[PDB]
Amino acid sequence: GNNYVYIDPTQLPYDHKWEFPRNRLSFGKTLGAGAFGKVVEATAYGLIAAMTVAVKMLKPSAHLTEREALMSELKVLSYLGNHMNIVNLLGACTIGGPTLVITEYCCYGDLLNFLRRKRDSFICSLALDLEDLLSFSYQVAKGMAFLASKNCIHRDLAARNILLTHGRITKICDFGLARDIKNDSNYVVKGNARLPVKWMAPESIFNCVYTFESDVWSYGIFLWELFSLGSSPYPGMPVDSKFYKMIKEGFRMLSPEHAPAEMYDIMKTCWDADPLKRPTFKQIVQLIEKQISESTN
Numbered sequence: 001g002n003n004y005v006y007i008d009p010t011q012l013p014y015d016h017k018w019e020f021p022r023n024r025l026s027f028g029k030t031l032g033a034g035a036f037g038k039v040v041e042a043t044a045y046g047l048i049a050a051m052t053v054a055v056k057m058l059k060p061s062a063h064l065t066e067r068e069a070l071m072s073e074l075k076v077l078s079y080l081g082n083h084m085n086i087v088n089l090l091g092a093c094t095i096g097g098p099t100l101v102i103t104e105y106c107c108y109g110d111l112l113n114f115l116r117r118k119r120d121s122f123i124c125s126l127a128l129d130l131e132d133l134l135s136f137s138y139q140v141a142k143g144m145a146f147l148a149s150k151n152c153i154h155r156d157l158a159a160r161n162i163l164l165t166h167g168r169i170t171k172i173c174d175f176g177l178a179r180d181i182k183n184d185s186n187y188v189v190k191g192n193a194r195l196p197v198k199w200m201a202p203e204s205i206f207n208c209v210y211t212f213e214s215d216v217w218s219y220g221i222f223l224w225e226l227f228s229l230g231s232s233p234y235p236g237m238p239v240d241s242k243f244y245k246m247i248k249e250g251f252r253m254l255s256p257e258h259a260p261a262e263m264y265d266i267m268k269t270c271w272d273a274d275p276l277k278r279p280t281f282k283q284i285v286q287l288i289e290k291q292i293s294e295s296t297n
């Protein structure tokens with residue numbers, strides 16, 4: 001069934017129940033920006049009282065193409081619904097001004113910078129420790145399991161696309177238009193596209209197919225970011241003809257030092273060249289559940 005269909009976001013309904021009075025939004029600092037869009041912190045009144053929210057709005061430079069993208073984004077978040085381990089949609093202002101999408105604000109920011117900020121404090125096996133890492137590994141697989149169950153393929157899963165909020169709960173997100181991928185070197189020109197190659201499955205790279213199983217490969221690379229406390233993958237190794245050659249041959253990363261053995265076995269299986277031998281996210285959630293209990297006490 002689900003291997004043969006996909007949701008076309010332009011074919012989803014937009015319910016106007018999301019529409020929010022744009023004069024009840026007060027904008028604050030920018031959290032991230034791309035050419036045509038940005039994500040800004042904001043205050044919203046009477047949305048659920050004053051509350052802090054995040055807003056992804058189009059810049060003045062933006063074209064119909066980017067507006068369409070943002071409207072499709074709105075439709076997908078509405079379609080996905082609101083869940084613990086995915087960024088939650090709160091509202092939108094799509095007329096009478098810049099088109100924008102309103103979500104919850106995640107108070108600890110994106111996971112990659114957080115891990116980097118916390119690397120030096122790390123308590124080997126408040127500060128970070130192994131159960132934090134396991135908890136994040138679990139919550140991301142769990143969120144992805146839900147995405148897969150809705151037949152939603154992420155395509156840019158990596159630590160930079162995860163946010164962290166209260167109680168060290170992770171929220172999968174996608175900055176999309178509001179990231180400056182031209183000046184982010186994790187995105188590499190490949191044809192007529194800058195792509196997150198070091199995170200991508202071979203079949204995606206060479207064949208431009210993105211599947212449930214290619215997201216699992218990126219999750220593997222994410223695991224390596226996580227247990228490497230925010231290190232860039234394939235250190236010292238530029239994307240080029242040689243890098244492509246080497247992934248195709250079976251070259252893979254060695255375990256991060258802080259990864260339990262079972263976590264690295266998960267990474268390795270995520271990285272199988274045969275998409276069909278990779279675990280599903282449902283399976284990963286199970287294995288990590290067990291690890292977390294074993295690692296407790």
Ligand SMILES: Cc1ccc(C(=O)Nc2ccc(CN3CCN(C)CC3)c(C(F)(F)F)c2)cc1C#Cc1cnc2cccnn12
Pocket residue numbers: 031032039054055056073076077080086087101102103104105106107108109110147152153154155156163172173174175176
């Ligand atoms: C305002 C805002 C609007 C939208 C989104 C957003 O994540 N959009 C999104 C679009 C698509 C998809 C799924 N597709 C992926 C592509 N794929 C090809 C198809 C399926 C998903 C996903 F979560 F489901 F993954 C999310 C995030 C923010 C934020 C924020 C925020 C909150 N706190 C902080 C603190 C610091 C910085 N930012 N920030």
